[PDB]
PDB file of all heavy atoms in Angstrom:
ATOM      1  N   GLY A  45      11.119   1.733 -13.279  1.00 57.95           N
ATOM      2  CA  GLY A  45      11.123   2.540 -12.000  1.00 57.95           C
ATOM      3  C   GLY A  45      10.544   3.923 -12.396  1.00 57.95           C
ATOM      4  O   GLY A  45      10.379   4.219 -13.518  1.00 57.95           O
ATOM      5  N   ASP A  46      10.210   4.642 -11.214  1.00 56.68           N
ATOM      6  CA  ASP A  46       9.709   6.001 -11.337  1.00 56.68           C
ATOM      7  C   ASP A  46       9.404   6.614  -9.929  1.00 56.68           C
ATOM      8  O   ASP A  46       9.553   7.786  -9.820  1.00 56.68           O
ATOM      9  CB  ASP A  46       8.304   5.999 -12.208  1.00 56.68           C
ATOM     10  CG  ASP A  46       7.748   7.357 -12.552  1.00 56.68           C
ATOM     11  OD1 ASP A  46       8.232   8.299 -11.816  1.00 56.68           O
ATOM     12  OD2 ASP A  46       6.987   7.410 -13.269  1.00 56.68           O
ATOM     13  N   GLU A  47       8.787   5.745  -9.007  1.00 55.89           N
ATOM     14  CA  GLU A  47       8.427   6.272  -7.725  1.00 55.89           C
ATOM     15  C   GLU A  47       9.621   6.677  -7.001  1.00 55.89           C
ATOM     16  O   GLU A  47       9.660   7.837  -6.502  1.00 55.89           O
ATOM     17  CB  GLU A  47       7.706   5.108  -6.961  1.00 55.89           C
ATOM     18  CG  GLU A  47       7.388   5.566  -5.504  1.00 55.89           C
ATOM     19  CD  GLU A  47       6.355   6.538  -5.603  1.00 55.89           C
ATOM     20  OE1 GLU A  47       5.587   6.613  -6.565  1.00 55.89           O
ATOM     21  OE2 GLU A  47       6.170   7.376  -4.763  1.00 55.89           O
ATOM     22  N   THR A  48      10.842   6.028  -7.144  1.00 54.28           N
ATOM     23  CA  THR A  48      12.026   6.356  -6.397  1.00 54.28           C
ATOM     24  C   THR A  48      13.279   5.902  -7.318  1.00 54.28           C
ATOM     25  O   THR A  48      14.223   6.688  -7.249  1.00 54.28           O
ATOM     26  CB  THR A  48      11.982   5.830  -4.955  1.00 54.28           C
ATOM     27  OG1 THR A  48      13.343   6.288  -4.448  1.00 54.28           O
ATOM     28  CG2 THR A  48      11.919   4.314  -5.012  1.00 54.28           C
ATOM     29  N   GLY A  49      13.145   4.750  -7.941  1.00 51.47           N
ATOM     30  CA  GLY A  49      14.248   4.298  -8.691  1.00 51.47           C
ATOM     31  C   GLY A  49      13.840   2.952  -9.475  1.00 51.47           C
ATOM     32  O   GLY A  49      12.644   2.714  -9.550  1.00 51.47           O
ATOM     33  N   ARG A  50      14.791   2.315 -10.048  1.00 53.37           N
ATOM     34  CA  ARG A  50      14.529   1.151 -10.841  1.00 53.37           C
ATOM     35  C   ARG A  50      14.741  -0.175  -9.977  1.00 53.37           C
ATOM     36  O   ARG A  50      15.686  -0.247  -9.139  1.00 53.37           O
ATOM     37  CB  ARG A  50      15.334   1.052 -12.056  1.00 53.37           C
ATOM     38  CG  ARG A  50      14.728   2.068 -13.037  1.00 53.37           C
ATOM     39  CD  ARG A  50      15.572   1.848 -14.419  1.00 53.37           C
ATOM     40  NE  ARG A  50      17.043   2.445 -14.239  1.00 53.37           N
ATOM     41  CZ  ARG A  50      17.922   2.273 -15.159  1.00 53.37           C
ATOM     42  NH1 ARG A  50      17.728   1.748 -16.322  1.00 53.37           N
ATOM     43  NH2 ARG A  50      19.119   2.743 -14.958  1.00 53.37           N
ATOM     44  N   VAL A  51      14.040  -1.174 -10.349  1.00 54.02           N
ATOM     45  CA  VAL A  51      14.016  -2.564  -9.628  1.00 54.02           C
ATOM     46  C   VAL A  51      13.785  -3.572 -10.772  1.00 54.02           C
ATOM     47  O   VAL A  51      13.076  -3.358 -11.643  1.00 54.02           O
ATOM     48  CB  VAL A  51      13.087  -2.554  -8.494  1.00 54.02           C
ATOM     49  CG1 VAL A  51      11.627  -2.284  -8.965  1.00 54.02           C
ATOM     50  CG2 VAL A  51      13.227  -3.922  -7.732  1.00 54.02           C
ATOM     51  N   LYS A  52      14.152  -4.809 -10.402  1.00 55.18           N
ATOM     52  CA  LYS A  52      13.987  -5.929 -11.314  1.00 55.18           C
ATOM     53  C   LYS A  52      12.365  -6.161 -11.431  1.00 55.18           C
ATOM     54  O   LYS A  52      11.688  -6.251 -10.297  1.00 55.18           O
ATOM     55  CB  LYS A  52      14.708  -7.122 -10.839  1.00 55.18           C
ATOM     56  CG  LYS A  52      14.537  -8.283 -12.043  1.00 55.18           C
ATOM     57  CD  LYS A  52      15.517  -9.432 -11.718  1.00 55.18           C
ATOM     58  CE  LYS A  52      16.944  -9.040 -11.813  1.00 55.18           C
ATOM     59  NZ  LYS A  52      17.804 -10.269 -11.636  1.00 55.18           N
ATOM     60  N   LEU A  53      11.946  -6.445 -12.655  1.00 52.61           N
ATOM     61  CA  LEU A  53      10.501  -6.687 -12.761  1.00 52.61           C
ATOM     62  C   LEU A  53      10.303  -7.822 -13.795  1.00 52.61           C
ATOM     63  O   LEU A  53      10.554  -7.600 -14.953  1.00 52.61           O
ATOM     64  CB  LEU A  53       9.786  -5.460 -13.222  1.00 52.61           C
ATOM     65  CG  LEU A  53       8.202  -5.418 -12.907  1.00 52.61           C
ATOM     66  CD1 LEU A  53       7.933  -4.437 -11.836  1.00 52.61           C
ATOM     67  CD2 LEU A  53       7.489  -5.031 -14.310  1.00 52.61           C
ATOM     68  N   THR A  54       9.870  -8.906 -13.376  1.00 50.17           N
ATOM     69  CA  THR A  54       9.542 -10.080 -14.371  1.00 50.17           C
ATOM     70  C   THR A  54       8.010 -10.295 -14.323  1.00 50.17           C
ATOM     71  O   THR A  54       7.454 -10.494 -13.362  1.00 50.17           O
ATOM     72  CB  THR A  54      10.210 -11.289 -13.837  1.00 50.17           C
ATOM     73  OG1 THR A  54      11.632 -11.023 -13.684  1.00 50.17           O
ATOM     74  CG2 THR A  54      10.082 -12.401 -14.817  1.00 50.17           C
ATOM     75  N   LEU A  55       7.450 -10.431 -15.728  1.00 49.54           N
ATOM     76  CA  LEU A  55       6.070 -10.660 -15.751  1.00 49.54           C
ATOM     77  C   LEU A  55       5.864 -12.103 -16.243  1.00 49.54           C
ATOM     78  O   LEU A  55       6.651 -12.719 -16.988  1.00 49.54           O
ATOM     79  CB  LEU A  55       5.559  -9.644 -16.873  1.00 49.54           C
ATOM     80  CG  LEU A  55       4.832  -8.447 -16.047  1.00 49.54           C
ATOM     81  CD1 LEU A  55       5.938  -7.494 -15.440  1.00 49.54           C
ATOM     82  CD2 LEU A  55       4.151  -7.621 -17.073  1.00 49.54           C
ATOM     83  N   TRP A  56       4.782 -12.679 -15.880  1.00 45.37           N
ATOM     84  CA  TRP A  56       4.527 -14.056 -16.210  1.00 45.37           C
ATOM     85  C   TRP A  56       3.269 -14.136 -17.242  1.00 45.37           C
ATOM     86  O   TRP A  56       2.194 -13.460 -17.030  1.00 45.37           O
ATOM     87  CB  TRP A  56       4.010 -14.830 -14.934  1.00 45.37           C
ATOM     88  CG  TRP A  56       5.258 -15.031 -14.103  1.00 45.37           C
ATOM     89  CD1 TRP A  56       5.801 -13.948 -13.351  1.00 45.37           C
ATOM     90  CD2 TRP A  56       6.017 -16.282 -13.845  1.00 45.37           C
ATOM     91  NE1 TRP A  56       6.835 -14.355 -12.611  1.00 45.37           N
ATOM     92  CE2 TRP A  56       7.052 -15.755 -12.944  1.00 45.37           C
ATOM     93  CE3 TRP A  56       6.055 -17.550 -14.239  1.00 45.37           C
ATOM     94  CZ2 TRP A  56       8.125 -16.646 -12.411  1.00 45.37           C
ATOM     95  CZ3 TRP A  56       6.905 -18.371 -13.849  1.00 45.37           C
ATOM     96  CH2 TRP A  56       7.981 -18.036 -12.880  1.00 45.37           C
ATOM     97  N   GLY A  57       3.415 -15.030 -18.256  1.00 47.40           N
ATOM     98  CA  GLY A  57       2.329 -15.270 -19.259  1.00 47.40           C
ATOM     99  C   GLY A  57       2.309 -14.163 -20.331  1.00 47.40           C
ATOM    100  O   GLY A  57       3.230 -13.495 -20.540  1.00 47.40           O
ATOM    101  N   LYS A  58       1.109 -13.914 -20.859  1.00 43.43           N
ATOM    102  CA  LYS A  58       0.944 -12.978 -21.978  1.00 43.43           C
ATOM    103  C   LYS A  58       1.277 -11.582 -21.459  1.00 43.43           C
ATOM    104  O   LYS A  58       1.866 -10.840 -22.197  1.00 43.43           O
ATOM    105  CB  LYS A  58      -0.616 -12.951 -22.320  1.00 43.43           C
ATOM    106  CG  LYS A  58      -1.553 -12.527 -21.130  1.00 43.43           C
ATOM    107  CD  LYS A  58      -3.078 -12.578 -21.541  1.00 43.43           C
ATOM    108  CE  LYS A  58      -3.857 -12.126 -20.320  1.00 43.43           C
ATOM    109  NZ  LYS A  58      -5.260 -12.089 -20.903  1.00 43.43           N
ATOM    110  N   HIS A  59       1.319 -11.372 -20.085  1.00 45.34           N
ATOM    111  CA  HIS A  59       1.765 -10.179 -19.422  1.00 45.34           C
ATOM    112  C   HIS A  59       3.233 -10.052 -19.700  1.00 45.34           C
ATOM    113  O   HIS A  59       3.814  -8.943 -19.986  1.00 45.34           O
ATOM    114  CB  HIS A  59       1.392 -10.065 -18.118  1.00 45.34           C
ATOM    115  CG  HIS A  59      -0.112 -10.074 -17.768  1.00 45.34           C
ATOM    116  ND1 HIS A  59      -0.912  -9.028 -18.078  1.00 45.34           N
ATOM    117  CD2 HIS A  59      -1.000 -11.080 -17.395  1.00 45.34           C
ATOM    118  CE1 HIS A  59      -2.161  -9.248 -17.932  1.00 45.34           C
ATOM    119  NE2 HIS A  59      -2.196 -10.597 -17.435  1.00 45.34           N
ATOM    120  N   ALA A  60       3.895 -11.155 -19.692  1.00 47.19           N
ATOM    121  CA  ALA A  60       5.338 -11.255 -19.912  1.00 47.19           C
ATOM    122  C   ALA A  60       5.736 -10.664 -21.319  1.00 47.19           C
ATOM    123  O   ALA A  60       6.777  -9.938 -21.482  1.00 47.19           O
ATOM    124  CB  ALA A  60       5.823 -12.532 -19.739  1.00 47.19           C
ATOM    125  N   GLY A  61       4.938 -11.071 -22.276  1.00 47.53           N
ATOM    126  CA  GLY A  61       5.144 -10.791 -23.682  1.00 47.53           C
ATOM    127  C   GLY A  61       4.478  -9.394 -24.087  1.00 47.53           C
ATOM    128  O   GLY A  61       4.684  -9.021 -25.185  1.00 47.53           O
ATOM    129  N   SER A  62       3.702  -8.832 -23.124  1.00 48.90           N
ATOM    130  CA  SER A  62       2.918  -7.633 -23.437  1.00 48.90           C
ATOM    131  C   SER A  62       3.817  -6.452 -22.969  1.00 48.90           C
ATOM    132  O   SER A  62       3.203  -5.227 -23.097  1.00 48.90           O
ATOM    133  CB  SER A  62       1.602  -7.612 -22.846  1.00 48.90           C
ATOM    134  OG  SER A  62       1.785  -7.546 -21.414  1.00 48.90           O
ATOM    135  N   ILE A  63       5.004  -6.477 -22.663  1.00 49.80           N
ATOM    136  CA  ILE A  63       5.809  -5.284 -22.156  1.00 49.80           C
ATOM    137  C   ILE A  63       6.575  -4.668 -23.237  1.00 49.80           C
ATOM    138  O   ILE A  63       6.852  -5.427 -24.304  1.00 49.80           O
ATOM    139  CB  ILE A  63       6.755  -5.729 -21.041  1.00 49.80           C
ATOM    140  CG1 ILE A  63       7.692  -6.823 -21.510  1.00 49.80           C
ATOM    141  CG2 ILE A  63       5.910  -6.302 -19.753  1.00 49.80           C
ATOM    142  CD1 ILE A  63       8.937  -7.046 -20.571  1.00 49.80           C
ATOM    143  N   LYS A  64       6.920  -3.357 -23.190  1.00 48.14           N
ATOM    144  CA  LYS A  64       7.656  -2.796 -24.162  1.00 48.14           C
ATOM    145  C   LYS A  64       8.444  -1.569 -23.608  1.00 48.14           C
ATOM    146  O   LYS A  64       7.975  -0.884 -22.794  1.00 48.14           O
ATOM    147  CB  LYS A  64       6.639  -2.325 -25.253  1.00 48.14           C
ATOM    148  CG  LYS A  64       7.283  -2.196 -26.690  1.00 48.14           C
ATOM    149  CD  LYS A  64       7.348  -3.726 -27.249  1.00 48.14           C
ATOM    150  CE  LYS A  64       8.382  -3.847 -28.353  1.00 48.14           C
ATOM    151  NZ  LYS A  64       9.736  -3.714 -27.736  1.00 48.14           N
ATOM    152  N   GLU A  65       9.638  -1.467 -24.056  1.00 51.03           N
ATOM    153  CA  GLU A  65      10.586  -0.307 -23.571  1.00 51.03           C
ATOM    154  C   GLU A  65      10.029   1.031 -23.956  1.00 51.03           C
ATOM    155  O   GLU A  65       9.507   1.269 -25.146  1.00 51.03           O
ATOM    156  CB  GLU A  65      12.006  -0.475 -24.158  1.00 51.03           C
ATOM    157  CG  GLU A  65      12.033  -0.554 -25.603  1.00 51.03           C
ATOM    158  CD  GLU A  65      13.355  -0.970 -26.158  1.00 51.03           C
ATOM    159  OE1 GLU A  65      13.716  -2.109 -25.862  1.00 51.03           O
ATOM    160  OE2 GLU A  65      14.046  -0.108 -26.768  1.00 51.03           O
ATOM    161  N   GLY A  66       9.957   1.916 -23.085  1.00 53.27           N
ATOM    162  CA  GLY A  66       9.479   3.218 -23.452  1.00 53.27           C
ATOM    163  C   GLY A  66       8.018   3.406 -23.106  1.00 53.27           C
ATOM    164  O   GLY A  66       7.330   4.564 -23.005  1.00 53.27           O
ATOM    165  N   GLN A  67       7.341   2.332 -22.787  1.00 52.52           N
ATOM    166  CA  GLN A  67       5.893   2.278 -22.414  1.00 52.52           C
ATOM    167  C   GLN A  67       5.634   2.287 -20.954  1.00 52.52           C
ATOM    168  O   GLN A  67       6.257   1.575 -20.215  1.00 52.52           O
ATOM    169  CB  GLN A  67       5.258   0.913 -22.915  1.00 52.52           C
ATOM    170  CG  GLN A  67       3.765   0.903 -22.713  1.00 52.52           C
ATOM    171  CD  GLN A  67       3.198  -0.494 -23.185  1.00 52.52           C
ATOM    172  OE1 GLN A  67       3.659  -1.528 -22.675  1.00 52.52           O
ATOM    173  NE2 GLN A  67       2.291  -0.616 -24.035  1.00 52.52           N
ATOM    174  N   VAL A  68       4.972   3.334 -20.533  1.00 52.38           N
ATOM    175  CA  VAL A  68       4.631   3.573 -19.113  1.00 52.38           C
ATOM    176  C   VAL A  68       3.651   2.486 -18.567  1.00 52.38           C
ATOM    177  O   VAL A  68       2.521   2.401 -19.212  1.00 52.38           O
ATOM    178  CB  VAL A  68       4.118   4.940 -18.832  1.00 52.38           C
ATOM    179  CG1 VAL A  68       2.783   5.241 -19.556  1.00 52.38           C
ATOM    180  CG2 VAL A  68       3.952   5.173 -17.288  1.00 52.38           C
ATOM    181  N   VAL A  69       3.882   1.754 -17.684  1.00 54.67           N
ATOM    182  CA  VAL A  69       2.918   0.604 -17.039  1.00 54.67           C
ATOM    183  C   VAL A  69       2.722   0.843 -15.634  1.00 54.67           C
ATOM    184  O   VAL A  69       3.604   1.139 -14.803  1.00 54.67           O
ATOM    185  CB  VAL A  69       3.597  -0.789 -17.349  1.00 54.67           C
ATOM    186  CG1 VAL A  69       4.887  -0.907 -16.581  1.00 54.67           C
ATOM    187  CG2 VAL A  69       2.740  -1.872 -16.986  1.00 54.67           C
ATOM    188  N   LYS A  70       1.507   0.612 -15.129  1.00 55.96           N
ATOM    189  CA  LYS A  70       1.103   0.831 -13.839  1.00 55.96           C
ATOM    190  C   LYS A  70       0.573  -0.612 -13.286  1.00 55.96           C
ATOM    191  O   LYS A  70      -0.195  -1.236 -13.937  1.00 55.96           O
ATOM    192  CB  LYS A  70      -0.058   1.804 -13.735  1.00 55.96           C
ATOM    193  CG  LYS A  70      -0.516   2.038 -12.215  1.00 55.96           C
ATOM    194  CD  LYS A  70      -1.664   3.091 -12.166  1.00 55.96           C
ATOM    195  CE  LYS A  70      -1.999   3.341 -10.794  1.00 55.96           C
ATOM    196  NZ  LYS A  70      -3.063   4.335 -10.754  1.00 55.96           N
ATOM    197  N   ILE A  71       1.007  -0.987 -12.131  1.00 52.45           N
ATOM    198  CA  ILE A  71       0.673  -2.150 -11.579  1.00 52.45           C
ATOM    199  C   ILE A  71       0.054  -1.976 -10.100  1.00 52.45           C
ATOM    200  O   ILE A  71       0.420  -1.078  -9.406  1.00 52.45           O
ATOM    201  CB  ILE A  71       1.959  -3.083 -11.432  1.00 52.45           C
ATOM    202  CG1 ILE A  71       2.940  -2.404 -10.559  1.00 52.45           C
ATOM    203  CG2 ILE A  71       2.414  -3.342 -12.902  1.00 52.45           C
ATOM    204  CD1 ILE A  71       4.147  -3.282 -10.291  1.00 52.45           C
ATOM    205  N   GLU A  72      -0.968  -2.835  -9.867  1.00 52.87           N
ATOM    206  CA  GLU A  72      -1.687  -2.839  -8.622  1.00 52.87           C
ATOM    207  C   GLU A  72      -1.636  -4.200  -7.968  1.00 52.87           C
ATOM    208  O   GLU A  72      -1.719  -5.255  -8.663  1.00 52.87           O
ATOM    209  CB  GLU A  72      -3.012  -2.313  -8.773  1.00 52.87           C
ATOM    210  CG  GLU A  72      -2.996  -0.816  -9.379  1.00 52.87           C
ATOM    211  CD  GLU A  72      -4.506  -0.336  -9.470  1.00 52.87           C
ATOM    212  OE1 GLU A  72      -5.233  -0.304  -8.451  1.00 52.87           O
ATOM    213  OE2 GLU A  72      -4.817   0.062 -10.555  1.00 52.87           O
ATOM    214  N   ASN A  73      -1.542  -4.327  -6.618  1.00 55.43           N
ATOM    215  CA  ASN A  73      -1.603  -5.584  -5.847  1.00 55.43           C
ATOM    216  C   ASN A  73      -0.516  -6.513  -6.491  1.00 55.43           C
ATOM    217  O   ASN A  73      -0.650  -7.727  -6.567  1.00 55.43           O
ATOM    218  CB  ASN A  73      -2.923  -6.154  -5.974  1.00 55.43           C
ATOM    219  CG  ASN A  73      -3.039  -7.346  -5.026  1.00 55.43           C
ATOM    220  OD1 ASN A  73      -3.168  -7.143  -3.762  1.00 55.43           O
ATOM    221  ND2 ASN A  73      -3.102  -8.629  -5.521  1.00 55.43           N
TER     222      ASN A  73
END
Side-chain angles (χ1 to χ4, degrees):
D46 188 344
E47 182 62 26
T48 179
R50 284 184 292 174
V51 62
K52 192 176 286 184
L53 200 112
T54 304
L55 266 68
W56 293 74
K58 62 181 180 180
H59 293 289
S62 67
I63 59 167
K64 213 79 198 72
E65 59 192 65
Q67 184 183 58
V68 63
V69 63
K70 183 179 180 180
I71 58 170
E72 298 180 58
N73 192 70

